[PDB]
Short mmCIF file of C-alpha atoms in Angstrom, two decimals:
data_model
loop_
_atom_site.label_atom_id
_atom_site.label_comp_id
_atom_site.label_asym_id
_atom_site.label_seq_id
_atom_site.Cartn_x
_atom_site.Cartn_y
_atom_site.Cartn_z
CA UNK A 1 25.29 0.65 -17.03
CA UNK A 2 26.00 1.81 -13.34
CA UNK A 3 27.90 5.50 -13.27
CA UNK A 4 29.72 6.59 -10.16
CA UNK A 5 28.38 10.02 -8.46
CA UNK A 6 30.62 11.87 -6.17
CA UNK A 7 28.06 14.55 -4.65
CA UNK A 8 26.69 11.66 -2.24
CA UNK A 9 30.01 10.80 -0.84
CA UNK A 10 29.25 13.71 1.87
CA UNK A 11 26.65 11.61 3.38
CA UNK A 12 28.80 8.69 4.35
CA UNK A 13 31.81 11.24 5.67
CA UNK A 14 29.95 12.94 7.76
CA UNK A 15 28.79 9.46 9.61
CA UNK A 16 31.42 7.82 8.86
CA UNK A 17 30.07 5.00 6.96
CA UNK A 18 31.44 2.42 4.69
CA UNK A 19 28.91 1.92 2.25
CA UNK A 20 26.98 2.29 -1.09
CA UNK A 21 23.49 3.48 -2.35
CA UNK A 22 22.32 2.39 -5.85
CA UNK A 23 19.83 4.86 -7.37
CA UNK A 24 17.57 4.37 -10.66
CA UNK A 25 15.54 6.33 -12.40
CA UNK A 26 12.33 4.42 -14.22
CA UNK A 27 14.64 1.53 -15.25
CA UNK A 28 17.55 -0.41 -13.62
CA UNK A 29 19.53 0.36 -17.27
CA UNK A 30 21.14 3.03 -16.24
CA UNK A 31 21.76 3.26 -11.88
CA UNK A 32 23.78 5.72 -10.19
CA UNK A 33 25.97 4.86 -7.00
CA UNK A 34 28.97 6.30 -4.68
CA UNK A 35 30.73 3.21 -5.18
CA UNK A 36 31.24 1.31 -8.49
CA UNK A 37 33.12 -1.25 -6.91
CA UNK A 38 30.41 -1.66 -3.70
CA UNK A 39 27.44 -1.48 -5.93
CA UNK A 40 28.11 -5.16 -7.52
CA UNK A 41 29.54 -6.56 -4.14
CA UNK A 42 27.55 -9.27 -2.44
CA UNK A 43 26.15 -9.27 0.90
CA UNK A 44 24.17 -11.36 3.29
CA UNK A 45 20.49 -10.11 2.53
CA UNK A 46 19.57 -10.74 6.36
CA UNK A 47 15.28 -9.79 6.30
CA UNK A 48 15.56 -8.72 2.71
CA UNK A 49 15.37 -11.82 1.79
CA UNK A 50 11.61 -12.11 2.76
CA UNK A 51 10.75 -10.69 -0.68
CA UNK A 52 11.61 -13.34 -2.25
CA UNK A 53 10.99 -15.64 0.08
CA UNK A 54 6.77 -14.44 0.55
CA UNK A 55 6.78 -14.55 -3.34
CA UNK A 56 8.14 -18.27 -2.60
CA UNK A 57 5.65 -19.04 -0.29
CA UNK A 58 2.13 -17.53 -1.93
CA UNK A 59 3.76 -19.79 -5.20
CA UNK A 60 4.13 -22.89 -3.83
CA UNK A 61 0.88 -23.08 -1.86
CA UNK A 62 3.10 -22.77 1.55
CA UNK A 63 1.42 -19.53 2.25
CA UNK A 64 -2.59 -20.20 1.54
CA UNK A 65 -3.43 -16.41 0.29
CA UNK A 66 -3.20 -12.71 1.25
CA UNK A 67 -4.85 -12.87 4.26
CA UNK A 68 -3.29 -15.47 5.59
CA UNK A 69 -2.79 -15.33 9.59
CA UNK A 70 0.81 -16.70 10.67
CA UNK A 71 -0.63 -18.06 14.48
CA UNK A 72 1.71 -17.89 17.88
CA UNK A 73 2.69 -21.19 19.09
CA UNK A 74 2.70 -19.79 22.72
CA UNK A 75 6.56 -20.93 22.51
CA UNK A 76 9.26 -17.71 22.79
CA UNK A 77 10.67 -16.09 20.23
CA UNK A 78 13.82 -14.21 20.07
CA UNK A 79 11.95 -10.62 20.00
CA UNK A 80 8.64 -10.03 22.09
CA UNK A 81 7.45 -8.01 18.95
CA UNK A 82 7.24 -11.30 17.18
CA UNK A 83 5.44 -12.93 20.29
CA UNK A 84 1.82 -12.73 18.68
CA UNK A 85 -0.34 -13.69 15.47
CA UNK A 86 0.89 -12.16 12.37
CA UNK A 87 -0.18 -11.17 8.85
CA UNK A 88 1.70 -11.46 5.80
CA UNK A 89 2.57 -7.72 5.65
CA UNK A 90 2.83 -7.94 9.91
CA UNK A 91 5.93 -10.45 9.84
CA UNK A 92 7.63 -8.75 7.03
CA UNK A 93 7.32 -5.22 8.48
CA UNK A 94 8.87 -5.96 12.12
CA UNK A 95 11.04 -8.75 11.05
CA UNK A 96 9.19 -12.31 11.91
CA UNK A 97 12.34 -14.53 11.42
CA UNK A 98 10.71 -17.60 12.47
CA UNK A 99 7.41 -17.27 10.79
CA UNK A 100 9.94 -17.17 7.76
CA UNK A 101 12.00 -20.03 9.05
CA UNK A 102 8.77 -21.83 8.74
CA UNK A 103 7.78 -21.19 5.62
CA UNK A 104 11.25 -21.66 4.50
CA UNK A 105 11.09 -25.07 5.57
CA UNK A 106 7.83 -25.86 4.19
CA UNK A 107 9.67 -24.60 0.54
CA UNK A 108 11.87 -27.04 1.00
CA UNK A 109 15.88 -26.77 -0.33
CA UNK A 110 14.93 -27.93 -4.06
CA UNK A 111 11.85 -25.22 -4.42
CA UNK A 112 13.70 -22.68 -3.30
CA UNK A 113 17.19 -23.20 -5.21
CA UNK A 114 14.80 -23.68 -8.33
CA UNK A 115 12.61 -19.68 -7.50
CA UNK A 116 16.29 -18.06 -6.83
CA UNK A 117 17.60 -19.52 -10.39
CA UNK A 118 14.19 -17.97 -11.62
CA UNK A 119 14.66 -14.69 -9.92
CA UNK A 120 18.20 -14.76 -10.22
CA UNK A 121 18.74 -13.69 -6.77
CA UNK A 122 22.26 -12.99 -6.09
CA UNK A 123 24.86 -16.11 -5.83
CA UNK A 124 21.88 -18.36 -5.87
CA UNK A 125 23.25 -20.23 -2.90
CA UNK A 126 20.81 -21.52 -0.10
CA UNK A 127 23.42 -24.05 1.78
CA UNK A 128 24.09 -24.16 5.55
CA UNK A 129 20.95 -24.91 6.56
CA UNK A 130 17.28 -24.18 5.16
CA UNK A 131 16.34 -21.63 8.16
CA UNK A 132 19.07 -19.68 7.95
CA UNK A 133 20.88 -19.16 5.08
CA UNK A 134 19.91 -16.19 4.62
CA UNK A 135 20.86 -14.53 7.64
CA UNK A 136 24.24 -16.75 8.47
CA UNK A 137 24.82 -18.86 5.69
CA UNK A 138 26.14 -18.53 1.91
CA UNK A 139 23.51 -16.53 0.58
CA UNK A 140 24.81 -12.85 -1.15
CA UNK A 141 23.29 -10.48 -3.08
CA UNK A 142 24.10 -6.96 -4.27
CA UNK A 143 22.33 -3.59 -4.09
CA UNK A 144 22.66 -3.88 -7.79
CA UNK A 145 20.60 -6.76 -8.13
CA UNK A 146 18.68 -6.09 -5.13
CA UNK A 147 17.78 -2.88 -7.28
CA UNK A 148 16.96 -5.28 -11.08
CA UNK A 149 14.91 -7.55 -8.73
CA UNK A 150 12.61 -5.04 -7.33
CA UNK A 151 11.90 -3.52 -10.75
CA UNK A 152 10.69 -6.95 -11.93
CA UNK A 153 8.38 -7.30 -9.30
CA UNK A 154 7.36 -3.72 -9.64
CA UNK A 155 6.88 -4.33 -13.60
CA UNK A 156 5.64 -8.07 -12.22
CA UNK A 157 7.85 -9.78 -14.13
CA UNK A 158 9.16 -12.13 -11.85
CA UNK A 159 8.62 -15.98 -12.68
CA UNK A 160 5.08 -15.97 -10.65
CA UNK A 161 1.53 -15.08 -10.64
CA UNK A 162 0.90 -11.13 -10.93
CA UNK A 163 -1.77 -11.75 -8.06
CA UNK A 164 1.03 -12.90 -5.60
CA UNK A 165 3.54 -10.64 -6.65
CA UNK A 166 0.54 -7.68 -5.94
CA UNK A 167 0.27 -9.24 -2.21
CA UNK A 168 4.04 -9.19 -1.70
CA UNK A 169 4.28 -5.61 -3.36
CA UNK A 170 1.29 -4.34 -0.78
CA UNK A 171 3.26 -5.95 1.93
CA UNK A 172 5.70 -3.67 1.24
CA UNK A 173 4.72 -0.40 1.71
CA UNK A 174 6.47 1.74 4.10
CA UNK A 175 5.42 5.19 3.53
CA UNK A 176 2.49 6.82 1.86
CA UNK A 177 2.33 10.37 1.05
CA UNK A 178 -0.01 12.39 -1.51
CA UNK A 179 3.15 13.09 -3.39
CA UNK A 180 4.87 9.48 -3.69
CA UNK A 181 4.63 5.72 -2.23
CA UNK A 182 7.64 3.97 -0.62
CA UNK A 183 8.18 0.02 -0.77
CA UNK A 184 11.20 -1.08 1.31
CA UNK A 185 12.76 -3.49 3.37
CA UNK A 186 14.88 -3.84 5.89
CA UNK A 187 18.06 -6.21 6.30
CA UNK A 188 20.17 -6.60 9.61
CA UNK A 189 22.80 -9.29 9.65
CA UNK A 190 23.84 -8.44 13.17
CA UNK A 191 27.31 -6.76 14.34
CA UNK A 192 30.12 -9.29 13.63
CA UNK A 193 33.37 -8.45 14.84
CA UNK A 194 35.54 -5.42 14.09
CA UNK A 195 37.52 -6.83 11.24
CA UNK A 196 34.40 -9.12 9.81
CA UNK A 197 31.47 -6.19 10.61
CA UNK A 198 27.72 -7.30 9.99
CA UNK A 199 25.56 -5.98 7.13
CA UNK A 200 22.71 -3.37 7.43
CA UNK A 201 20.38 -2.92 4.39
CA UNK A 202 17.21 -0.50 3.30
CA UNK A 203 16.00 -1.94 -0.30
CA UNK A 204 13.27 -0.99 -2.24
CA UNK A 205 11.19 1.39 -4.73
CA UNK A 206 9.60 4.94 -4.69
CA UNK A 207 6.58 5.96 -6.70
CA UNK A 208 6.29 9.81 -7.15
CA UNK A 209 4.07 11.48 -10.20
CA UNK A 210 4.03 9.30 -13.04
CA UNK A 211 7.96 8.55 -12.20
CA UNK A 212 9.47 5.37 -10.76
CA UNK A 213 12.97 5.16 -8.58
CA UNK A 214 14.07 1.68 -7.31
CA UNK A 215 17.10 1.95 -4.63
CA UNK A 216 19.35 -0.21 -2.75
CA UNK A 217 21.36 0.57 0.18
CA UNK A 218 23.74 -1.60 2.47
CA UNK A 219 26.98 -0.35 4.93
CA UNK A 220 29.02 -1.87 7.36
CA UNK A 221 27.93 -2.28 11.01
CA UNK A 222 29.67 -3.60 14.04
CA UNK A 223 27.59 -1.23 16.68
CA UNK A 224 23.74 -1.05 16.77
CA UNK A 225 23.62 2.45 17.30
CA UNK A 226 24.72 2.74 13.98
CA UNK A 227 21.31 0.89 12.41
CA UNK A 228 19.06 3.91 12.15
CA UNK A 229 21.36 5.44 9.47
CA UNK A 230 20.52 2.72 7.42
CA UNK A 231 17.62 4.43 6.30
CA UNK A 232 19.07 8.18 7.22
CA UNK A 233 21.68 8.33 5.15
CA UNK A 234 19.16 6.85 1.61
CA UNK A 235 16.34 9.04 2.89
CA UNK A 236 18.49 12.36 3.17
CA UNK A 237 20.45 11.35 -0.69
CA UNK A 238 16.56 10.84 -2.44
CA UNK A 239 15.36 13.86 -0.35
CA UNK A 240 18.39 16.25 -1.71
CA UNK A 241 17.29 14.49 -4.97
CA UNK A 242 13.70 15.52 -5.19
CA UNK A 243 12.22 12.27 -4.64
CA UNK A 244 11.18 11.97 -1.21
CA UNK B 1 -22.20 -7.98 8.03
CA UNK B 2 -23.32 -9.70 11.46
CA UNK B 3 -24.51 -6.85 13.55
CA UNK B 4 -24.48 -2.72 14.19
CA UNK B 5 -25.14 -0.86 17.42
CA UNK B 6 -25.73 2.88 18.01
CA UNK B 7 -22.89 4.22 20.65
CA UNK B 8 -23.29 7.59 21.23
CA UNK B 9 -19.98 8.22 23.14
CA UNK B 10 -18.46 9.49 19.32
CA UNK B 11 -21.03 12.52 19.44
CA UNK B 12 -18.50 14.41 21.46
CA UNK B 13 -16.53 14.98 18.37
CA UNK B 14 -19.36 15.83 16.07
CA UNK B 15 -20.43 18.27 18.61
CA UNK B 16 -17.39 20.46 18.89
CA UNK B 17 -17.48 21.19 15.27
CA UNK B 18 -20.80 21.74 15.23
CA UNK B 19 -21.18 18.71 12.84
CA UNK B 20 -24.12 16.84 11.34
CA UNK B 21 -22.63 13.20 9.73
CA UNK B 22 -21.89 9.68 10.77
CA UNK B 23 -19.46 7.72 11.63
CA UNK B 24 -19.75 3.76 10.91
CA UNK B 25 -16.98 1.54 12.44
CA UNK B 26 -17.16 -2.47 11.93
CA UNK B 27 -15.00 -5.23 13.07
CA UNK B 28 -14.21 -7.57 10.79
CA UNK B 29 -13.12 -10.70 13.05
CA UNK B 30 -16.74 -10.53 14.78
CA UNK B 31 -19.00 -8.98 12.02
CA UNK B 32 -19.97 -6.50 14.21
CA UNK B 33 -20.38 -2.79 13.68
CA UNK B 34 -20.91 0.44 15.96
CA UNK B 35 -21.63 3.95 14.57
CA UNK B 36 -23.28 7.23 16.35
CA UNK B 37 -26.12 7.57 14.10
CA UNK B 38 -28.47 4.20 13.11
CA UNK B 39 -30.57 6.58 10.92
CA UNK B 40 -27.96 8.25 9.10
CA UNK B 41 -25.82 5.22 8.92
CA UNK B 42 -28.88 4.17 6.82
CA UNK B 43 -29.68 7.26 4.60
CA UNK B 44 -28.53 7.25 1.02
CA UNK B 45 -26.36 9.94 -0.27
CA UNK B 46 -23.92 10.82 -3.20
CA UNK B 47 -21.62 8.92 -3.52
CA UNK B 48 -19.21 11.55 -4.92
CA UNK B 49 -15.13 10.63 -5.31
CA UNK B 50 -16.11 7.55 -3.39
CA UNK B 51 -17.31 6.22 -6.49
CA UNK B 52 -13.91 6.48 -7.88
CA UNK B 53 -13.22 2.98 -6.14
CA UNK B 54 -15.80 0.81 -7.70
CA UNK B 55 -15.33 3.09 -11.06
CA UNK B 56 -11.96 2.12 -10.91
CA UNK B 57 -12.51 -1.79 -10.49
CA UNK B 58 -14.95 -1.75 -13.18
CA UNK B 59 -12.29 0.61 -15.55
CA UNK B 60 -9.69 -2.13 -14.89
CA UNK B 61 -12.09 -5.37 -15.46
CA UNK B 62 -13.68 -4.01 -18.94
CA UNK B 63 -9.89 -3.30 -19.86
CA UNK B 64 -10.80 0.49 -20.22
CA UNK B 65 -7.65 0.92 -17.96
CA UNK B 66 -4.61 -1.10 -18.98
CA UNK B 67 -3.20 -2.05 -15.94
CA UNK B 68 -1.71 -0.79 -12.42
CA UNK B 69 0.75 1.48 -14.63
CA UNK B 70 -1.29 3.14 -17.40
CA UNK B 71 -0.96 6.81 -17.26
CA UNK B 72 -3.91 8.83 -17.74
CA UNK B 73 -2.12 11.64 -20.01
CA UNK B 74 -2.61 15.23 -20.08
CA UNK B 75 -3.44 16.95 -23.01
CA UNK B 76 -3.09 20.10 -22.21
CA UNK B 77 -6.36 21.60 -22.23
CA UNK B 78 -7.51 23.71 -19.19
CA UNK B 79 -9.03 21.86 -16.48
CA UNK B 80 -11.11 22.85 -12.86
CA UNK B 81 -8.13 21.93 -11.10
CA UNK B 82 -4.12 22.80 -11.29
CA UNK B 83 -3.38 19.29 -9.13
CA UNK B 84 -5.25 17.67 -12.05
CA UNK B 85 -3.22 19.19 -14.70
CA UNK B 86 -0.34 16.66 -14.85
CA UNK B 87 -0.18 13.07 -15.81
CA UNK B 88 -1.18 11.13 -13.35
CA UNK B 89 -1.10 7.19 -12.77
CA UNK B 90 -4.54 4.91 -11.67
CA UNK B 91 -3.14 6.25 -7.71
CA UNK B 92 -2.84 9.87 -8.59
CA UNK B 93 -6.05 10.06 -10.39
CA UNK B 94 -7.60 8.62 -7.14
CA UNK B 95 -5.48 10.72 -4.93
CA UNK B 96 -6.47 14.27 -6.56
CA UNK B 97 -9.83 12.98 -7.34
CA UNK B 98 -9.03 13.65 -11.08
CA UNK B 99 -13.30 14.60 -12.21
CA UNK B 100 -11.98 14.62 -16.00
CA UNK B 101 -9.67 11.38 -15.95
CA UNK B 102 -12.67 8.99 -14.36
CA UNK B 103 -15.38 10.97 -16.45
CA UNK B 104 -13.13 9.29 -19.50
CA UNK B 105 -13.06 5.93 -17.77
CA UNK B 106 -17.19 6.10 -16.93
CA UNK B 107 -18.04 6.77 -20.45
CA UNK B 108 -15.55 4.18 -22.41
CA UNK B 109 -17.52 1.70 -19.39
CA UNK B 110 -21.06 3.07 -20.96
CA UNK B 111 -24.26 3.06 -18.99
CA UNK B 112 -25.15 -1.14 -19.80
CA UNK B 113 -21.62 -2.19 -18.19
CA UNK B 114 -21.75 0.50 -15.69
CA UNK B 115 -25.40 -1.03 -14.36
CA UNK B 116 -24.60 -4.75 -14.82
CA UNK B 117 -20.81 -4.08 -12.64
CA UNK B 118 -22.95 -2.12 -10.15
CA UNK B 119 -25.86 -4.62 -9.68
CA UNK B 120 -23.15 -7.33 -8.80
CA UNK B 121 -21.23 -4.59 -6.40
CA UNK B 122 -24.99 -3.89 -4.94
CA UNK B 123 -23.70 -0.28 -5.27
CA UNK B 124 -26.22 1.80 -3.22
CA UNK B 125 -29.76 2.18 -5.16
CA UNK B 126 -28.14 1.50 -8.47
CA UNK B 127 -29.25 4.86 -10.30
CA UNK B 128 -27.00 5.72 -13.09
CA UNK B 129 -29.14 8.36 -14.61
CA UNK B 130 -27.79 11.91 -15.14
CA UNK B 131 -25.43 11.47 -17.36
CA UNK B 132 -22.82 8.89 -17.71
CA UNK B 133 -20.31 11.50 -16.47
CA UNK B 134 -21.78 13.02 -13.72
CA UNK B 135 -24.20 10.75 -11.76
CA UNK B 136 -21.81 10.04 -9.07
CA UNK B 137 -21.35 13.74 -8.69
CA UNK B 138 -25.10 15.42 -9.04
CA UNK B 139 -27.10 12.48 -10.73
CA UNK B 140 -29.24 10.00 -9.10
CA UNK B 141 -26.84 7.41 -7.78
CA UNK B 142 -27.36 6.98 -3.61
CA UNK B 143 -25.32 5.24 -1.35
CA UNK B 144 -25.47 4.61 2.50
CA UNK B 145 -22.28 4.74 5.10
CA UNK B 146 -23.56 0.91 6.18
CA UNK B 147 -23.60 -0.05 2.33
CA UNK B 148 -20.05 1.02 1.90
CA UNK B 149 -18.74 -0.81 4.86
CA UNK B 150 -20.28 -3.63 2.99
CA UNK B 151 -18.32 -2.93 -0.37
CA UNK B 152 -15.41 -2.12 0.81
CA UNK B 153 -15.24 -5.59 2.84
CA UNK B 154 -16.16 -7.40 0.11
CA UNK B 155 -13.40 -5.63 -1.94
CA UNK B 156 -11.18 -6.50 1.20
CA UNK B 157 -12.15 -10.44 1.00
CA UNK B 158 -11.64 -10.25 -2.79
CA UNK B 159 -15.31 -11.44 -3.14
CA UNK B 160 -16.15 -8.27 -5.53
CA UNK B 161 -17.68 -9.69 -9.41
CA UNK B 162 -14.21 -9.28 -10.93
CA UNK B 163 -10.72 -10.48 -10.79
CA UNK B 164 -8.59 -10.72 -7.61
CA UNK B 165 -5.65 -9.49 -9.94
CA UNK B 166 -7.57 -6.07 -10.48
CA UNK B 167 -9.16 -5.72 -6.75
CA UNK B 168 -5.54 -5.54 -5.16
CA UNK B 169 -4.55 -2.91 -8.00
CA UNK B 170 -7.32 -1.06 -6.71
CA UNK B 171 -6.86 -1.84 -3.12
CA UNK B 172 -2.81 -0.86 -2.86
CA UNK B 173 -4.20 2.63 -5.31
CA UNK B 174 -6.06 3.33 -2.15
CA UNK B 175 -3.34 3.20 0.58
CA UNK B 176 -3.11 6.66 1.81
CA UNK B 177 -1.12 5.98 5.55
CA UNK B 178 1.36 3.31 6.23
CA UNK B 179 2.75 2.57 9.63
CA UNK B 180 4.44 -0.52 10.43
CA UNK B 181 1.91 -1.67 12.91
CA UNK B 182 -1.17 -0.52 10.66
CA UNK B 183 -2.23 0.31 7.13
CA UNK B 184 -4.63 2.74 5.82
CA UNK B 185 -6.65 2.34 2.91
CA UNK B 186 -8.76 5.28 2.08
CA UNK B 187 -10.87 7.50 0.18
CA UNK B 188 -12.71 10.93 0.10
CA UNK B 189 -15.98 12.07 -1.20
CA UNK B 190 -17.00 16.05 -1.55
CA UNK B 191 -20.78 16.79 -3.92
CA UNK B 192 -20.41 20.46 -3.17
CA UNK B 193 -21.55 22.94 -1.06
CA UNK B 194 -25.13 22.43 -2.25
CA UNK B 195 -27.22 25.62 -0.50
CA UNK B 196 -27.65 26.57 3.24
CA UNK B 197 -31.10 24.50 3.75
CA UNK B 198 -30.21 21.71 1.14
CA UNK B 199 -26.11 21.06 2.62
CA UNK B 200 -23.68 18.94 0.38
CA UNK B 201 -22.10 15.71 1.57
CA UNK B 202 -18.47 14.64 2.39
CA UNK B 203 -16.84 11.53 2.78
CA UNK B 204 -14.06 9.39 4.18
CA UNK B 205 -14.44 5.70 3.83
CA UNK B 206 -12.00 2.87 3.57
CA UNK B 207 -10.61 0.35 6.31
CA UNK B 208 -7.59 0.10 8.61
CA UNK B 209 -5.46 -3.51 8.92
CA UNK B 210 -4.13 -3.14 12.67
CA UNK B 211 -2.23 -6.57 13.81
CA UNK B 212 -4.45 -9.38 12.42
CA UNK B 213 -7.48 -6.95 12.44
CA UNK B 214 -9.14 -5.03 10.06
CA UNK B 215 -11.25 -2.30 10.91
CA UNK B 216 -13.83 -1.07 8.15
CA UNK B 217 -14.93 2.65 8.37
CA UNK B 218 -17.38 5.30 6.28
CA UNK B 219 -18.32 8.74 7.40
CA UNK B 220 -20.24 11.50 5.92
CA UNK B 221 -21.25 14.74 6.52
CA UNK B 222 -23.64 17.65 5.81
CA UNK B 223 -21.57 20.45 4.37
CA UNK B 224 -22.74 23.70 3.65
CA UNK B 225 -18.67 25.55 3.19
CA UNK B 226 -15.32 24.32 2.03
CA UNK B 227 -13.84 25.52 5.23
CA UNK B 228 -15.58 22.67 6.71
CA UNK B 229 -14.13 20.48 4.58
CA UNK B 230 -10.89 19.06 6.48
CA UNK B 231 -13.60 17.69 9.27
CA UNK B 232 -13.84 15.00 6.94
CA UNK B 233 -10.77 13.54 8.24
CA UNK B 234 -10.06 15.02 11.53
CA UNK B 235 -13.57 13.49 12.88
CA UNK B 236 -13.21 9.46 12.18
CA UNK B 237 -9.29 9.74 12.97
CA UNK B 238 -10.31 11.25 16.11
CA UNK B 239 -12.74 8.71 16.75
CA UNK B 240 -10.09 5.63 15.57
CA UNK B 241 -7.67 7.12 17.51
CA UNK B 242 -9.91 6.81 20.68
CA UNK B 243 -10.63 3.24 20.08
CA UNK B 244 -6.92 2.69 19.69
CA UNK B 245 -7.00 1.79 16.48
CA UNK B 246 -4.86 4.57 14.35
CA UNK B 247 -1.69 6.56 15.53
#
């Protein structure tokens, strides 16, 4: 059950921002969103797709164990931020697309169409190329199931070992407060045109007293500027909300 | 690990506050460790909250506590603290140093698995004795700032006597600061004010993973009033914000 709720809509006005924000309390059985319609539509899942895709790698061997140090070929990369060793949690948190390219193609196409049945991650499609289907091929997912994914690997139900859905989970961790925990990701498809805009996400969970909220956020982006409301426009909704 | 040196530069910041402790800082990529104070570094002392870490590990390997989501639930009897009268999950009971909820865990462990768990930790001196629900707090059991380094790196490396499974429940229960070029994993220790010629102790220990990194820490102090108290903190961030290490 997903209900519509109106009082967010003032969020996305006052920005002017098309898009949606998927919000559930302790269970993905009952979410609230802005959009009914949004909340089920698929998008490119850009970096959130390295969730599923460290989970992929600690499974298959691909990456050797938690502290496992993704080395710097010395050749350039498309952001200097990326431009040095890496740890697990280091590549996810500022984006390593090519240490994930990597370990994508180490995967291989058959593992990794086999984990996304398992997770049932979105429209399950990884053609177009094994590096980069995810951030310009077929691959879509909604905040709705980017929201029933998260609470399986919160709950660790996902189709792998609890230890390497713990690393993946600890990779994840954004914000930490005496009050509440944040897991999130980010996901930036880039800016498209102005008819065909690009996709900007901020995924995840939020663990405050003995209560649980997963979320889910993506809008439309054709302007950079725009990408630190990604994560404004969420924040200030589970603020208003109590949770953060 | 590999090596410690005595650098007196950190002094500076136990001097303004007119502070008595030690700081311990080791690298883990070259073994090697620095602190201010080679004695203290050495001396035993309670372990206090600090022994909530290892307590925990041990609660979640005799299957005492469930697993990463049980909730320690409130009764509703009056406790010593109003943060500690909620429920609270294995990271809140850590966070608020919950006495009463790890006091439950301690004696459903018992003294014999509390002794063998510790032995293969190499917990300090190994003393137990003073009660099964107090010992940490004002019983026997010592440990030293160069001995935590050592458990808390071997809780790092997984190489602890229990399962990997439970020493990364433990190990994301103790993240306490998350920035996206480091993470903090961390936790505090307070005995009590003790008197004015016998002080109490305080802690911080835990480690910092900065880049490919990781940077393990313990400090104590002598503490005679809870004034004092915040020092606990201010002191070793200070310190690991000089070396470049935190913010």
């Amino acid at each position: 059950s997903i209900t519509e709720n109106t009082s967010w809509n003032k969020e996305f006005s006052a920005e002017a921002v098309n898009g949606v924000f998927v919000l559930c309390k302790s269970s993905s059985k009952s979410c609230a969103t802005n959009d009914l319609a949004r909340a089920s539509k698929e998008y490119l899942p850009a970096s959130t797709f390295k969730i599923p895709n460290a989970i992929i790698g600690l499974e298959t061997g691909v990456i050797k164990n938690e502290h496992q140090v993704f080395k710097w070929d010395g050749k350039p990369r498309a952001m200097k931020q990326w431009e040095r060793d890496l740890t697990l949690r280091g590549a996810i948190q500022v984006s390593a697309v090519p240490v994930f390219q990597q370990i994508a193609r180490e995967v291989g196409e058959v593992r990794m169409q086999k984990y996304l049945k398992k997770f049932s991650y979105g429209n399950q499609n990884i053609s177009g190329g094994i590096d980069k289907f995810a951030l310009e091929g077929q691959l879509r997912i909604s905040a709705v199931n980017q929201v029933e994914f998260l609470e399986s690997l919160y709950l660790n139900k996902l189709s792998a070992s609890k230890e390497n859905q713990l690393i993946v989970k600890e990779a994840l961790v954004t914000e930490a407060a005496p009050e509440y925990l944040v897991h999130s990701k980010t996901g930036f498809s880039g800016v498209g045109t102005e008819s065909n805009p690009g996709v900007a996400w901020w995924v995840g969970w939020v663990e405050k007293e003995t209560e649980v909220y997963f979320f889910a956020f993506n809008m439309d982006i054709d302007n950079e500027s725009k990408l630190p409301l990604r994560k404004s426009i969420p924040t200030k909704i589970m603020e208003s909300e109590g949770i953060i």
